[PDB]
Amino acid sequence: GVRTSPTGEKVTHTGQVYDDEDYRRVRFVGRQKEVNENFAIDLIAEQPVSQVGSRVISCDGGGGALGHPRVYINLDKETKTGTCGYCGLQFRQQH
Amino acid sequence: TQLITVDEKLDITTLTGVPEEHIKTRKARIFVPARNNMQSGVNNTKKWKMEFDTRERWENPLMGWASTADPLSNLVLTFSTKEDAIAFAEKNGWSYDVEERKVPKPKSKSYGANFSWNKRTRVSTK
């Protein structure tokens, strides 16, 4: 979900864009500002919330030893989902 | 004889190759560094340290990196006693300031004080 300043410059997933009166836009004159158009904050929002029947879930990001350190997430709050701290996949107790 | 007598003050500022700006404008700080209150270990409070005053760090126009012009901005020296650090600062012509070692004063700890009969020092829970 890349957006654009009034200067025409693309805003990154950080939120970085130069000011209009900043001289350092001259480095992109005749060249391009390389941004990545796959924003991870939007791509993890696209993932569905996993309904599990347990009270404590374990996440390793998939792949076993190719993901992250395995963590255990508590699902006793019903207002909030249980979000993994590494991969951002969020879980919910189904009851 | 084979030994001469030099009753002058020990000064080696002409031999260290340090420019004048980084001798006569710097303020060395001789100090025992405080314990990080994130932790309870005290092994970093055991020795004296000599550092210098921080100079300007600015933004690199290309990357935003911390550009410096202070060569002595990373120089931290380790000394066993205060007087060794003072002698090393005086030998190099560094004007210094010394902070005294702040050891914690001893406490009075009583586990039974948590459960007293008439004193306010009872714990309300345990």
């Binding site: 508590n74 | 994130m38 700890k109 586990y111 004080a113 020092t121 714990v123 829970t125």
Partner: protein, 688 residues
């Protein structure tokens, strides 16, 4: 002496009876590992990491709790001591989450460090771990309770030091959870210090969260200026940017704590900042300019002044270097009218004797008193670690506290005598029962807060309180070494300004208003443009644009307390120097550099060039502003008592009401805190 001889690994040490095993091993330089023992909290004995072998004893003892008996040989490095340490570290790492990379405690964790030192290097735990529901205890302390090792430093801090009694353990067994049990917002004035003493990342700093990491931070040891306590701090920075503020241990001030304002107002230090000199353009608007233009337009008006044509107001956050700089600059113009915002009465002795404007006993001397009388102050929010020291004396020494003023909450219990100042006449006449409580006390203590001196009868309140203090000290069982009369300040610049000889309060400017006004950080709004003449030439020198920078004609952007080495004197008279952590942003300079450059542009150049020459001048004006971390005692209470009897100023009938009643009024006091978004979230959290 009654010292008993014990042995640590064979080496003898002589200890007082009541010394624990941990302290006995401390006396020979060995630190027994611990998680729940804290030397400023009570002994819990419930992490079992300090289990150590006493020889000829087939059981490990809790070294934090077990007192030494005579003749014990403590085996801190023996086989079963190390087996006990590895077993206890194994149980601590059984259910602890694999969160070290996503944790703010990584690299500064006790559990990591003494797992590397005293535990095993691998797991036998083949089960699934627990996961604990997190809590919301405020906008300051991020809570991840899965990391909690259940050591109850939460509870001992919030009970004993913070005086809150609202953290505790619910549940039982492995399901035991530290929390408030309800959706409760733990916002004390010392609520961020549980971020310190939590050994794990269960309680982290929510503003500091994720931004830095401890090994890459440079540690600059500096001074708090958010009040007049003078808390020693560490400004930890990273690549020229302030990351956070930690406490330093100082046994006589702040023991190892800081307030929430100190801990979390460093982000107002990066908003609303004055970075370039500003002058008024042809349309009457502040526009950016160079230093040459701004210093010339100030110095051309300074050359056209003489006498009472020029005056100065000193704000709440100004170091003694800039204070004596601007004093010398205005004394070249023959102007004595240099003022502070905070009003101290000039009646009687005034600011001549230091003893009638200091915390003369000490911050440490609260531990030696038996009766403390707090007059007109709410010291929980005016000097929160001074109130922490009163609470520690209340807890461990059975201190009797009475308050004359509005019935505020002080986290302990006191004798509320009432809020009228005529009670001060009743105690000094013996008609009040607390007067006999003062007379039969060996070490009395009378603390008149400097916010009560902001009233119009502040000279009369000071005279009545000093009348009480000299009624007690000249007659009762006070030796002479003990100091009774004490004044608690709320402004870090105030005591250093009074030692240099400023005229406190702006009545010297309200008397005859000048046509040119310097404002060293003067953001209290005490003198606005309705008090000045039609076109006064107002110069603001400071680091934030809050109050005085809009009304200024020329803005001189200065340095903050993290941006200069700078002498600040606390409420007890101790002078203390800050250190340069970062440099001022943009074109802003150090404050006395600006005043000295203004003196050279004006042609009234001052006899200093370096900071050492400023401090030689500062020693010339009073020689105790350069002897750092020293409390110089001030005598001559009897002479100021005799001078205070000259004017019979009347006590007003208005009740003694401090301006900071609840936690709502604590977070935003000066221009750094008002610019702080963290203080904004704290106010928004406590007003709902």
């Amino acid at each position: 002496s009654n010292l008993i001889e014990v042995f640590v690994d064979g080496q003898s040490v002589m200890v007082e009876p009541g010394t624990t095993v941990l302290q006995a091993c401390e006396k020979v330089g060995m630190q027994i590992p611990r998680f729940c023992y804290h030397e400023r909290l009570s002994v819990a004995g419930n992490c079992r990491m300090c289990l150590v072998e006493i020889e000829k004893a087939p059981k490990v003892v809790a070294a934090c709790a077990m007192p030494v008996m005579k003749g014990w040989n403590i085996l801190t490095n023996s086989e079963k001591t190390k087996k006990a340490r590895e077993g206890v570290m194994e149980f601590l790492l059984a259910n602890h989450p694999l969160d070290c990379p996503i944790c703010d405690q990584g690299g500064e964790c006790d559990l990591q460090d003494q797992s590397m030192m005293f535990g095993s290097d691998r797991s036998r735990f083949l089960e699934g771990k627990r996961a604990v529901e997190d809590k919301n205890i405020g906008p300051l302390v991020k809570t991840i309770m899965t990391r909690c090792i259940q050591c109850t430093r939460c509870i001992r801090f919030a009970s004993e030091i913070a005086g809150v009694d609202d953290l505790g353990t619910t549940g039982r067994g492995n399901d035991m959870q530290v929390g408030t049990y309800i959706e409760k917002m733990f916002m004390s004035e010392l609520s961020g210090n549980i971020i310190d003493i939590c050994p794990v990342g269960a309680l982290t700093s929510k503003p500091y969260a994720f931004t830095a990491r401890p090994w890459e931070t440079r540690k600059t040891e500096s001074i708090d200026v958010m009040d007049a306590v003078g808390s020693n701090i560490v400004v930890s920075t990273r690549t020229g940017e302030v990351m956070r503020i930690l406490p330093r241990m100082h046994e006589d001030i702040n023991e190892e704590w800081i307030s929430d304002k100190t801990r979390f107002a460093y982000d107002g230090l990066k908003r609303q900042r004055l970075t370039e000199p500003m002058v008024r353009n042809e349309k009457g608007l502040l526009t950016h300019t160079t230093w040459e233009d701004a210093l010339s337009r100030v110095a051309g008006m300074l050359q056209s002044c003489q006498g009472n044509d020029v005056a100065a107001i000193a704000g709440g956050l100004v170091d003694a270097e800039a204070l004596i700089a601007l004093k010398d600059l205005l004394n070249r113009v023959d102007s004595d009218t240099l003022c502070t915002e905070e009003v101290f009465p000039t009646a009687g002795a005034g600011t001549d004797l230091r003893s009638n404007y200091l915390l003369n006993t000490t911050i440490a001397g609260v531990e030696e008193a038996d009766v403390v009388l707090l007059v007109g102050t709410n010291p929980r929010f005016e000097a929160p670690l001074f109130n922490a020291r009163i609470r520690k004396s209340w807890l461990h020494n059975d201190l009797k506290v009475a308050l004359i003023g509005s019935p505020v909450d002080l986290t302990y219990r006191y004798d509320h005598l009432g809020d009228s100042p005529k009670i001060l006449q009743d105690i000094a006449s013996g008609s009040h029962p607390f007067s006999q409580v003062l007379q039969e006390a060996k070490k009395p203590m009378v603390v008149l807060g400097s916010s009560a001196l902001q009233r119009n009868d502040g000279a009369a309140i000071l005279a009545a309180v000093s009348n009480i203090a000299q009624k007690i000290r000249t007659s009762s069982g006070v030796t002479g070494d003990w100091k009774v009369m004490n004044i608690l300040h709320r402004i870090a610049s105030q005591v250093a300004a009074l030692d240099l000889g400023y005229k406190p309060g702006v009545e010297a400017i309200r008397k005859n208003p000048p046509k040119m006004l310097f404002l060293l950080g003067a953001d209290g709004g005490c003198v606005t443009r309705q008090d000045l003449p039609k076109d006064c030439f107002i110069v603001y020198q400071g680091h934030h644009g809050d109050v005085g920078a809009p009304i200024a004609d020329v803005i001189l952007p200065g340095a903050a307390y993290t941006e200069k080495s700078a002498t600040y004197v606390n409420t007890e008279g101790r002078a203390q120097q800050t250190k340069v952590a970062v440099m001022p942003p943009g074109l802003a300079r150090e404050d006395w550099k600006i005043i000295r450059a203004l003196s050279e542009i004006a042609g009234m150049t001052l006899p200093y060039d370096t900071l050492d020459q400023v401090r030689n001048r500062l020693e010339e004006v009073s020689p105790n502003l350069v002897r750092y971390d020293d409390v110089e005692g001030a005598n001559y209470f009897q002479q100021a008592s005799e001078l205070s009897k000259l004017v019979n100023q009347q006590l007003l009938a208005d009740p003694l009401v401090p301006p900071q009643l609840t936690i709502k009024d604590f977070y935003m006091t000066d221009s750094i805190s008002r610019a702080s978004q963290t203080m904004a979230k704290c106010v928004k959290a406590v007003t709902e």
